[PDB]
Ligand binder design. Structure first.
Ligand SMILES: CC(C)Oc1ccc2cccc(-n3cc(NC(N)=O)c(C(N)=O)n3)c2c1
Ligand SMILES: CC(C)Oc1ccc2cccc(-n3cc(NC(N)=O)c(C(N)=O)n3)c2c1
Length: 263
């Protein structure tokens, strides 16, 4: 079962304040050390989420952060995850900027691509893949997290393509125009994630408003090549950013292409 009783969790340390509430380091009885995220009432559709728990608990892969269960006896509810010692990838890149070998950056992209190839095979769409949603664990392994969560977020300004907070910087044209999500729209986001990795955590299109990103992308403009990305790596990024989803590679194809580049 995915229901975790309150008596089975102990909070040890406050890790920080997230988007939906607090994050603690804690222990899960007879199981493991965990990250526990407390979710503010009203931030998510909890009833919708728990309906998918029996199916979603079956997903398991070394490059996906495991969400073990939910503590829901009383509000605010808690989501219990595998603990990722080095935190989010975006902050990890920014704090260690100048210390990364190009091979390590390519390895980080390969970990994410492997996790995404598993989700693509499982027919699970991430919808908001970005360096901020990837986590860094033991021996600098990168794992994907928060896949599918935007289907439960209750803030319309974030989830609607016409919303003032829409994450347009990672959105393919069919997502920013029609919310047409697919594993091919996640491939576009993955190309932006590759750019974030090779730029050591720079913000994509930092000098543009949301409408300006939409105009730039629709007129064929793309993110410039980061200094650390080889021309072969940048070519792959551009394949992720093809206007037509049908022309983008599947994650299964990207994984083989990037591994050949690495090895
Ligand atoms: C909550 C964030 C803003 O603050 C921190 C501060 C320090 C951290 C140190 C280590 C790990 C962190 N950490 C741990 C996380 N989750 C899991 N599954 O372990 C996350 C996350 N962003 O989801 N960040 C940390 C997160
Ligand atoms: C207790 C969990 C399995 O319940 C759910 C319920 C609904 C979900 C809907 C979309 C995605 C889910 N989801 C998200 C997960 N992991 C992270 N790191 O976000 C997992 C997992 N199996 O690791 N499942 C869901 C997980």
């Amino acid at each position: 079962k995915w229901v975790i009783d309150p008596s089975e969790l102990t909070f040890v340390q406050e890790i920080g304040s997230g988007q939906f509430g607090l994050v603690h380091l804690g222990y899960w009885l007879n199981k493991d050390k965990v990250a526990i995220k407390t979710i503010r009432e009203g931030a998510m559709s909890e009833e919708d989420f728990i309906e998918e728990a029996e199916v979603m608990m079956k997903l398991s892969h070394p490059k996906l952060v495991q969400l073990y269960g939910v503590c829901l006896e009383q509000a605010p509810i808690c989501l219990v995850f595998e603990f990722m010692e080095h935190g989010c990838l975006s902050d990890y890149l920014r704090t260690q900027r100048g210390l990364f070998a190009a091979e390590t950056l390519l390895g980080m992209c390969l970990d994410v691509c492997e996790g995404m190839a598993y989700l693509e095979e499982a027919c699970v769409i991430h919808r908001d893949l970005a360096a901020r949603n990837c986590l860094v664990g033991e021996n600098q392994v990168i794992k994907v997290s928060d896949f599918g969560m935007t289907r439960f977020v209750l803030d319309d300004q974030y989830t609607s393509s016409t919303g003032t907070k829409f994450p347009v910087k990672w959105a393919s044209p069919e997502v920013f125009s029609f919310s047409r999500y697919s594993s091919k729209s996640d491939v576009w986001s993955f190309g932006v994630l590759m750019w974030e990795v090779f730029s050591e955590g720079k913000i994509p299109y930092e000098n543009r408003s949301n409408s300006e990103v939409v105009e730039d992308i629709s007129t064929g403009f793309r993110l410039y090549k980061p200094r650390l990305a080889s021309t072969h790596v940048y070519q792959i990024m551009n394949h992720c950013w093809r206007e037509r989803p049908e022309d983008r590679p599947a994650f299964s194809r990207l994984l083989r292409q990037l591994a050949e580049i690495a090895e």
